[PDB]
PDB file of C-alpha atoms and ligand atoms in Angstrom:
ATOM      1  CA  UNK A 210      21.874 -14.530   8.295  1.00 25.98           C
ATOM      2  CA  UNK A 211      21.684 -11.026  10.123  1.00 24.32           C
ATOM      3  CA  UNK A 212      20.120  -9.584   7.421  1.00 23.66           C
ATOM      4  CA  UNK A 213      17.091 -11.889   7.808  1.00 21.74           C
ATOM      5  CA  UNK A 214      16.717 -11.132  11.538  1.00 22.72           C
ATOM      6  CA  UNK A 215      17.311  -7.618  11.218  1.00 24.13           C
ATOM      7  CA  UNK A 216      14.188  -7.743   8.652  1.00 24.32           C
ATOM      8  CA  UNK A 217      12.516  -9.559  11.159  1.00 22.49           C
ATOM      9  CA  UNK A 218      12.884  -6.935  13.778  1.00 25.40           C
ATOM     10  CA  UNK A 219      11.675  -4.897  11.755  1.00 23.35           C
ATOM     11  CA  UNK A 220       8.582  -6.351  11.120  1.00 22.07           C
ATOM     12  CA  UNK A 221       7.998  -7.085  14.943  1.00 24.75           C
ATOM     13  CA  UNK A 222       7.980  -3.592  15.925  1.00 24.36           C
ATOM     14  CA  UNK A 223       5.851  -1.863  12.917  1.00 24.64           C
ATOM     15  CA  UNK A 224       2.287  -1.329  12.155  1.00 24.17           C
ATOM     16  CA  UNK A 225       0.165   0.510  10.134  1.00 28.15           C
ATOM     17  CA  UNK A 226      -2.460   1.916  12.183  1.00 32.06           C
ATOM     18  CA  UNK A 227      -4.874   3.532   9.623  1.00 32.11           C
ATOM     19  CA  UNK A 228      -4.736   4.650   5.827  1.00 28.55           C
ATOM     20  CA  UNK A 229      -7.112   6.906   3.810  1.00 27.36           C
ATOM     21  CA  UNK A 230      -7.980   7.363  -0.055  1.00 26.94           C
ATOM     22  CA  UNK A 231      -9.115  10.793  -1.089  1.00 27.93           C
ATOM     23  CA  UNK A 232      -9.804  12.110  -4.448  1.00 25.50           C
ATOM     24  CA  UNK A 233      -6.324  14.185  -5.789  1.00 23.27           C
ATOM     25  CA  UNK A 234      -8.178  16.999  -7.123  1.00 26.68           C
ATOM     26  CA  UNK A 235     -11.047  17.562  -4.317  1.00 28.06           C
ATOM     27  CA  UNK A 236      -9.656  16.449  -1.579  1.00 24.23           C
ATOM     28  CA  UNK A 237     -12.801  14.260  -0.187  1.00 24.75           C
ATOM     29  CA  UNK A 238     -12.677  11.032   1.082  1.00 25.41           C
ATOM     30  CA  UNK A 239     -13.453   8.060  -0.501  1.00 24.38           C
ATOM     31  CA  UNK A 240     -12.162   5.115   1.755  1.00 23.86           C
ATOM     32  CA  UNK A 241     -10.771   4.337   5.211  1.00 23.20           C
ATOM     33  CA  UNK A 242      -9.601   1.281   6.907  1.00 24.01           C
ATOM     34  CA  UNK A 243      -7.843   0.597  10.497  1.00 23.78           C
ATOM     35  CA  UNK A 244      -6.447  -2.686   9.921  1.00 23.04           C
ATOM     36  CA  UNK A 245      -3.117  -3.600  10.008  1.00 22.59           C
ATOM     37  CA  UNK A 246      -2.550  -4.904   6.329  1.00 23.15           C
ATOM     38  CA  UNK A 247       1.504  -4.664   6.926  1.00 21.14           C
ATOM     39  CA  UNK A 248       0.247  -8.146   8.070  1.00 26.93           C
ATOM     40  CA  UNK A 249       1.589 -11.009   5.831  1.00 27.31           C
ATOM     41  CA  UNK A 250       0.546 -14.375   5.296  1.00 30.54           C
ATOM     42  CA  UNK A 251      -3.311 -12.995   5.775  1.00 31.27           C
ATOM     43  CA  UNK A 252      -5.129 -12.149   2.403  1.00 31.46           C
ATOM     44  CA  UNK A 253      -6.580  -8.306   3.527  1.00 29.81           C
ATOM     45  CA  UNK A 254      -9.941  -7.397   1.946  1.00 28.83           C
ATOM     46  CA  UNK A 255     -10.856  -3.792   0.648  1.00 26.93           C
ATOM     47  CA  UNK A 256     -14.099  -2.657  -0.159  1.00 24.46           C
ATOM     48  CA  UNK A 257     -13.536   0.516  -1.464  1.00 20.82           C
ATOM     49  CA  UNK A 258     -16.531   2.531  -3.459  1.00 21.96           C
ATOM     50  CA  UNK A 259     -16.395   2.306  -7.429  1.00 23.43           C
ATOM     51  CA  UNK A 260     -16.155   6.290  -7.854  1.00 25.10           C
ATOM     52  CA  UNK A 261     -12.808   5.999  -6.997  1.00 25.73           C
ATOM     53  CA  UNK A 262     -12.581   4.540 -10.690  1.00 27.92           C
ATOM     54  CA  UNK A 263     -13.913   8.102 -11.834  1.00 27.33           C
ATOM     55  CA  UNK A 264     -10.705  10.086 -10.263  1.00 23.77           C
ATOM     56  CA  UNK A 265      -7.814  11.277 -12.343  1.00 23.51           C
ATOM     57  CA  UNK A 266      -5.886  10.389  -9.268  1.00 22.88           C
ATOM     58  CA  UNK A 267      -6.047   9.384  -5.912  1.00 22.69           C
ATOM     59  CA  UNK A 268      -3.785  10.939  -2.567  1.00 21.89           C
ATOM     60  CA  UNK A 269      -3.147   7.929  -0.028  1.00 21.59           C
ATOM     61  CA  UNK A 270      -2.043   8.639   3.543  1.00 21.62           C
ATOM     62  CA  UNK A 271      -0.736   6.382   5.420  1.00 22.09           C
ATOM     63  CA  UNK A 272       0.250   6.207   9.168  1.00 25.34           C
ATOM     64  CA  UNK A 273       2.251   3.861  10.917  1.00 25.19           C
ATOM     65  CA  UNK A 274       4.663   3.404  13.797  1.00 26.46           C
ATOM     66  CA  UNK A 275       8.269   1.387  14.115  1.00 22.44           C
ATOM     67  CA  UNK A 276      10.031   0.800  17.151  1.00 23.14           C
ATOM     68  CA  UNK A 277      12.988   0.068  15.106  1.00 22.70           C
ATOM     69  CA  UNK A 278      15.200   2.572  13.174  1.00 19.39           C
ATOM     70  CA  UNK A 279      14.963   2.189   9.444  1.00 19.15           C
ATOM     71  CA  UNK A 280      17.331   3.849   7.137  1.00 18.16           C
ATOM     72  CA  UNK A 281      15.209   4.414   3.726  1.00 14.55           C
ATOM     73  CA  UNK A 282      12.069   3.110   4.080  1.00 15.88           C
ATOM     74  CA  UNK A 283      10.080   2.243   0.928  1.00 15.52           C
ATOM     75  CA  UNK A 284       7.566   0.232  -0.785  1.00 18.30           C
ATOM     76  CA  UNK A 285       7.158  -0.965  -4.192  1.00 20.41           C
ATOM     77  CA  UNK A 286       3.833  -2.111  -5.301  1.00 18.19           C
ATOM     78  CA  UNK A 287       2.296  -3.782  -7.919  1.00 19.01           C
ATOM     79  CA  UNK A 288      -1.318  -4.776  -8.890  1.00 16.46           C
ATOM     80  CA  UNK A 289      -2.259  -7.826 -10.427  1.00 15.81           C
ATOM     81  CA  UNK A 290      -5.425  -8.376 -12.377  1.00 14.09           C
ATOM     82  CA  UNK A 291      -6.076 -12.348 -12.349  1.00 12.64           C
ATOM     83  CA  UNK A 292      -2.404 -12.756 -11.982  1.00 13.46           C
ATOM     84  CA  UNK A 293      -1.665 -10.378 -14.984  1.00 12.21           C
ATOM     85  CA  UNK A 294       0.449  -7.431 -13.576  1.00 11.69           C
ATOM     86  CA  UNK A 295      -1.520  -3.710 -14.782  1.00 11.46           C
ATOM     87  CA  UNK A 296       0.719  -1.499 -12.329  1.00 14.47           C
ATOM     88  CA  UNK A 297       4.239  -1.235 -10.782  1.00 12.24           C
ATOM     89  CA  UNK A 298       4.372   1.307  -8.108  1.00 11.56           C
ATOM     90  CA  UNK A 299       7.456   2.853  -6.137  1.00  9.66           C
ATOM     91  CA  UNK A 300       7.725   5.086  -3.122  1.00  6.54           C
ATOM     92  CA  UNK A 301      10.132   6.071  -0.934  1.00  8.63           C
ATOM     93  CA  UNK A 302       9.407   7.764   2.426  1.00  3.88           C
ATOM     94  CA  UNK A 303      13.026   7.677   4.119  1.00  5.23           C
ATOM     95  CA  UNK A 304      14.659   7.639   7.219  1.00  4.11           C
ATOM     96  CA  UNK A 305      12.104   6.782  10.106  1.00  2.00           C
ATOM     97  CA  UNK A 306      13.065   7.674  13.988  1.00  2.00           C
ATOM     98  CA  UNK A 307      12.929   4.656  16.345  1.00  3.07           C
ATOM     99  CA  UNK A 308       9.390   4.509  18.289  1.00  3.97           C
ATOM    100  CA  UNK A 309       8.036   6.910  15.883  1.00  8.17           C
ATOM    101  CA  UNK A 310       4.746   7.602  14.593  1.00 10.33           C
ATOM    102  CA  UNK A 311       4.395   8.745  11.026  1.00  9.37           C
ATOM    103  CA  UNK A 312       1.812   9.998   8.538  1.00  7.21           C
ATOM    104  CA  UNK A 313       2.964   9.879   4.672  1.00  4.43           C
ATOM    105  CA  UNK A 314       1.257  11.045   2.083  1.00  2.00           C
ATOM    106  CA  UNK A 315       1.758   9.507  -1.696  1.00  3.33           C
ATOM    107  CA  UNK A 316      -0.462  10.317  -5.472  1.00  4.42           C
ATOM    108  CA  UNK A 317      -1.686   7.718  -7.025  1.00  3.35           C
ATOM    109  CA  UNK A 318      -2.160   7.386 -10.640  1.00  4.22           C
ATOM    110  CA  UNK A 319      -3.501   4.580 -12.908  1.00  2.00           C
ATOM    111  CA  UNK A 320      -2.611   3.981 -16.602  1.00  2.00           C
ATOM    112  CA  UNK A 321      -4.974   4.704 -19.077  1.00  2.00           C
ATOM    113  CA  UNK A 322      -5.027   0.715 -19.611  1.00  2.00           C
ATOM    114  CA  UNK A 323      -6.103   0.411 -16.261  1.00  2.00           C
ATOM    115  CA  UNK A 324      -8.594   3.397 -16.290  1.00  2.00           C
ATOM    116  CA  UNK A 325     -10.499   1.280 -19.378  1.00  2.00           C
ATOM    117  CA  UNK A 326     -11.364  -1.683 -17.292  1.00  2.00           C
ATOM    118  CA  UNK A 327     -14.882  -0.852 -15.383  1.00  2.00           C
ATOM    119  CA  UNK A 328     -15.550  -1.540 -11.412  1.00  2.00           C
ATOM    120  CA  UNK A 329     -17.907  -4.613 -12.561  1.00  2.00           C
ATOM    121  CA  UNK A 330     -14.685  -6.417 -14.126  1.00  2.00           C
ATOM    122  CA  UNK A 331     -12.036  -5.240 -11.693  1.00  2.00           C
ATOM    123  CA  UNK A 332     -13.849  -5.722  -8.453  1.00  2.00           C
ATOM    124  CA  UNK A 333     -12.676  -9.472  -6.587  1.00  2.00           C
ATOM    125  CA  UNK A 334      -9.986 -10.032  -9.435  1.00  2.00           C
ATOM    126  CA  UNK A 335      -7.629  -7.404  -8.213  1.00  2.00           C
ATOM    127  CA  UNK A 336      -4.752  -7.588  -5.659  1.00  2.00           C
ATOM    128  CA  UNK A 337      -2.245  -4.989  -4.287  1.00  2.00           C
ATOM    129  CA  UNK A 338       0.997  -6.851  -3.558  1.00  2.00           C
ATOM    130  CA  UNK A 339       3.070  -4.185  -1.404  1.00  2.00           C
ATOM    131  CA  UNK A 340       6.535  -5.132  -0.682  1.00  2.00           C
ATOM    132  CA  UNK A 341       7.963  -3.015   1.862  1.00  2.00           C
ATOM    133  CA  UNK A 342      11.748  -2.259   2.152  1.00  2.00           C
ATOM    134  CA  UNK A 343      14.371  -0.543   4.487  1.00  2.00           C
ATOM    135  CA  UNK A 344      16.740  -0.074   1.494  1.00  2.00           C
ATOM    136  CA  UNK A 345      17.640  -3.310  -0.242  1.00  2.00           C
ATOM    137  CA  UNK A 346      16.054  -5.234   2.673  1.00  2.00           C
ATOM    138  CA  UNK A 347      12.795  -6.811   2.692  1.00  3.27           C
ATOM    139  CA  UNK A 348      11.177  -6.716   5.589  1.00  2.19           C
ATOM    140  CA  UNK A 349       7.413  -7.743   4.664  1.00  2.00           C
ATOM    141  CA  UNK A 350       5.060  -8.734   1.463  1.00  2.13           C
ATOM    142  CA  UNK A 351       1.408  -8.569   1.899  1.00  3.45           C
ATOM    143  CA  UNK A 352      -1.537  -8.818  -0.335  1.00  4.71           C
ATOM    144  CA  UNK A 353      -4.723  -6.998  -0.262  1.00  4.06           C
ATOM    145  CA  UNK A 354      -7.829  -7.894  -2.743  1.00  9.14           C
ATOM    146  CA  UNK A 355     -10.059  -5.080  -3.605  1.00  8.72           C
ATOM    147  CA  UNK A 356     -13.553  -4.798  -4.305  1.00  7.60           C
ATOM    148  CA  UNK A 357     -15.313  -1.830  -6.207  1.00 10.14           C
ATOM    149  CA  UNK A 358     -18.574  -1.594  -4.574  1.00  7.85           C
TER     150      UNK A 358
HETATM  151  C1  LIG B 537      -6.085   0.035  -9.513  1.00  7.73           C
HETATM  152  C2  LIG B 537      -6.806   1.046  -9.949  1.00  7.73           C
HETATM  153  C3  LIG B 537      -7.185   0.652 -11.289  1.00  7.73           C
HETATM  154 CL1  LIG B 537      -6.672  -0.913 -11.730  1.00  7.73          CL
HETATM  155  C4  LIG B 537      -7.709   1.456 -12.131  1.00  7.73           C
HETATM  156  C5  LIG B 537      -7.963   2.820 -11.777  1.00  7.73           C
HETATM  157  C6  LIG B 537      -7.502   3.227 -10.474  1.00  7.73           C
HETATM  158  C7  LIG B 537      -6.852   2.472  -9.939  1.00  7.73           C
HETATM  159  N1  LIG B 537      -6.502   2.871  -8.653  1.00  7.73           N
HETATM  160  C8  LIG B 537      -6.983   2.550  -7.516  1.00  7.73           C
HETATM  161  O1  LIG B 537      -7.643   1.214  -7.385  1.00  7.73           O
HETATM  162  C9  LIG B 537      -6.746   3.126  -6.042  1.00  7.73           C
HETATM  163  C10 LIG B 537      -6.718   2.353  -5.136  1.00  7.73           C
HETATM  164  C11 LIG B 537      -5.217   2.382  -4.352  1.00  7.73           C
HETATM  165  N2  LIG B 537      -5.069   1.795  -3.389  1.00  7.73           N
HETATM  166  N3  LIG B 537      -6.160   0.789  -3.081  1.00  7.73           N
HETATM  167  C12 LIG B 537      -5.598   0.239  -1.845  1.00  7.73           C
HETATM  168  C13 LIG B 537      -7.050  -0.359  -1.167  1.00  7.73           C
HETATM  169  C14 LIG B 537      -4.756   0.016  -1.221  1.00  7.73           C
HETATM  170  C15 LIG B 537      -4.027  -0.526  -0.035  1.00  7.73           C
HETATM  171  C16 LIG B 537      -4.895  -0.870   0.868  1.00  7.73           C
HETATM  172  N4  LIG B 537      -2.787  -0.085  -0.219  1.00  7.73           N
HETATM  173  C17 LIG B 537      -2.073  -0.596   0.879  1.00  7.73           C
HETATM  174  C18 LIG B 537      -1.698  -2.172   1.272  1.00  7.73           C
HETATM  175  C19 LIG B 537      -0.603  -2.365   1.942  1.00  7.73           C
HETATM  176  C20 LIG B 537       0.049  -1.312   2.592  1.00  7.73           C
HETATM  177  C21 LIG B 537      -0.337  -0.607   2.246  1.00  7.73           C
HETATM  178  C22 LIG B 537      -1.197   0.507   1.642  1.00  7.73           C
HETATM  179  N5  LIG B 537      -2.337   0.701  -1.047  1.00  7.73           N
HETATM  180  C23 LIG B 537      -3.377   0.694  -1.597  1.00  7.73           C
HETATM  181  C24 LIG B 537      -3.649   1.822  -2.960  1.00  7.73           C
HETATM  182  O2  LIG B 537      -2.929   2.361  -3.233  1.00  7.73           O
END
């Protein structure tokens, strides 16, 4: 399949260089990471301060590079608590220039039901599954276990 291999080429040339999380209201940093969490197969770990749970919302910034051109680069994310899906998030970036590096800012809001759970119950039991697409085409699937510390 040309589709599978195209997806593979995109992945070989892609990485996430860093990300941030800010309080969306003040703009102050909460957490930042430098490991490439695009990487599938490994369960990644993220130890994020629990004050992030006391946020109406979070601003997130991803810096990534891609050798491959992408037509409509986007993300589907689902957040799981003990295998139960709490959130279902979508983000489009769009067209990506080949061999570019890009910063991308997204607003991240949780549902009330999510907000009704404490760090003590969430910590270690949350997994963000991140699906990276170009349009209709799955490039990579990574997962991150979160601790609220
Ligand atoms: C999740 C949540 C609950 Cl359950 C209740 C109340 C608020 C929240 N919101 C958060 O925890 C905000 C953190 C959002 N967040 N945290 C991390 C660690 C993220 C990572 C690693 N990613 C990410 C993963 C793979 C590739 C790109 C970004 N997105 C994240 C991401 O969107």
